[PDB]
Amino acid sequence: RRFAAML
Amino acid sequence: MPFVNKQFNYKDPVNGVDIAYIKIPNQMQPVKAFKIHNKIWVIPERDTFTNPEEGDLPPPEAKQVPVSYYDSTYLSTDNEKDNYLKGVTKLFERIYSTDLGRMLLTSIVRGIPFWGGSTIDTELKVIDTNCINVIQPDGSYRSEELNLVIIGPSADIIQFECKSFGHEVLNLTRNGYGSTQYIRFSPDFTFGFEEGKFATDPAVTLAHELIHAGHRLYGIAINPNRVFKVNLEVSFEELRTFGGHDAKFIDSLQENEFRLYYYNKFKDIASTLNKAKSIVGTASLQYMKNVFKEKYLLSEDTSGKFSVDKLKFDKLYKMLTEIYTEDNFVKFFKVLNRKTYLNFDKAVFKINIVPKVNYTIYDGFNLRNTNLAANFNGQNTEINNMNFTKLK
Ligand code: NI
Ligand SMILES: [Zn+2]
């Protein structure tokens, strides 16, 4: 998963 | 292998062996899939199966570029699917062409999900969600083991991720068993990162996912609920997947507690192999024992009994958890890349890596013998401006 998915 | 054993075209005739129609444990209509390598399949379709809550193509409160991106039209024609297929193929070859990638891919092929789907503890049975149903000439299906499926994204085209089917009573990705990994991914988009002038090499983005899949295939993935404050909370799993600079954020004590933990889980598997008396399927209990001996690098004594070798375990474990990392892949590819995981994409670009004048197995975007060779010009979306289309 891309960092975007931590947000 | 040259890795991928042939140049598939999406229109190539099915042969029921490496080009066929399949089902993925859901009823769904069959879709055309391609085995590009032992245990590895590619389904050039938008993923509207693997999730019940995800069987459509943009929701009301959807995020904007460059976090999410929507286009229900993407991957709906045979030309697109053929292109998708050839893109994914290229990236596998690009990854495989590196020593690091060669190893990761080998660990993945070897990483067959454990046969722990039986009620009797002396019986080895495959878990059905680790297979696909492959259509045969009479319209009958045959179940086939696989480790990895590359599939088109769902509604959100750039929501790349590893997904796998669960178990009523087993945590396959976390108990050392592993399960078949479905990677939502697209070769036709990438991201501009800080600082977003420079585009991420799609080979790096796939490798990232392959590393997650590595973890999950060996049942050593870390619960996403396990996070570390970073400043912001990020999962243990991602920080270690990226590696490099980010390693600093990982508590070494927990790191060691998981290691001992999974050494034990491998003992369980060894112990189970020792107690095995029967198997389901067609070869062979002895053959499956050897398969798993190799996966978990178990040691076999003269009486044929299995045990975990501490050295071999430490090497295997280290390989999967801190050698296969995004940061390390960057080094091998010698491309430009974010130096940390905590880096916001600043843009999204439509690309096309299939033409060899656009992107090569060896240089990615930064083709040698072109103006794009130096200073990562190939990754510079302002300089290599015909290879990138900024989205919305
Ligand atoms: Ni720092
Ligand atoms: Zn990730």
Author numbering:
A (entry chain C): 1 to 7
B (entry chain A): 1 to 26, 29 to 59, 61 to 198, 211 to 246, 256 to 306, 308 to 417
From the paper:
Once inside the neuronal cytosol, the LC cleaves specific peptide bonds (depending on the serotype) of proteins composing the neuronal SNARE complex: the synaptosomal-associated protein of 25 kDa (SNAP-25), the vesicle-associated membrane protein (VAMP), also referred to as synaptobrevin, and syntaxin. Of the seven BoNT serotype LCs, the BoNT serotype A LC (BoNT/A LC) possesses the longest duration of action in the neuronal cytosol.
One of the PLMs, JTH-NB72-39, was co-crystallized in complex with the BoNT/A LC protease, confirming the interactions aimed by our design strategy while revealing new, unforeseen inhibitor:enzyme contacts that will preface future studies to design more potent PLM and SMNPI inhibitors. The carbonyl oxygen of the JTH-NB72-39 P1 residue (Arg) coordinates the enzyme's catalytic Zn(II) ion (distance is 2.4 Å) and also engages in a hydrogen bond with the hydroxyl group of residue Tyr 366 (which is known to directly stabilize the tetrahedral intermediate formed during SNAP-25 catalysis), while the amino terminal group of the P1 Arg also coordinates the enzyme's catalytic Zn(II). Specifically, and in contrast to I1, the P1 Arg of the inhibitor engages, via a salt bridge, with the LC's Glu 164 residue while it also shares a hydrogen bond with the carbonyl oxygen of the LC's Cys 165 residue. The higher Ki value for JTH-NB72-39 compared to I1 is, in part, due to fewer favorable hydrophobic contacts provided by the PLM's Phe component in the P2′ position versus the larger P2′ Trp of I1.
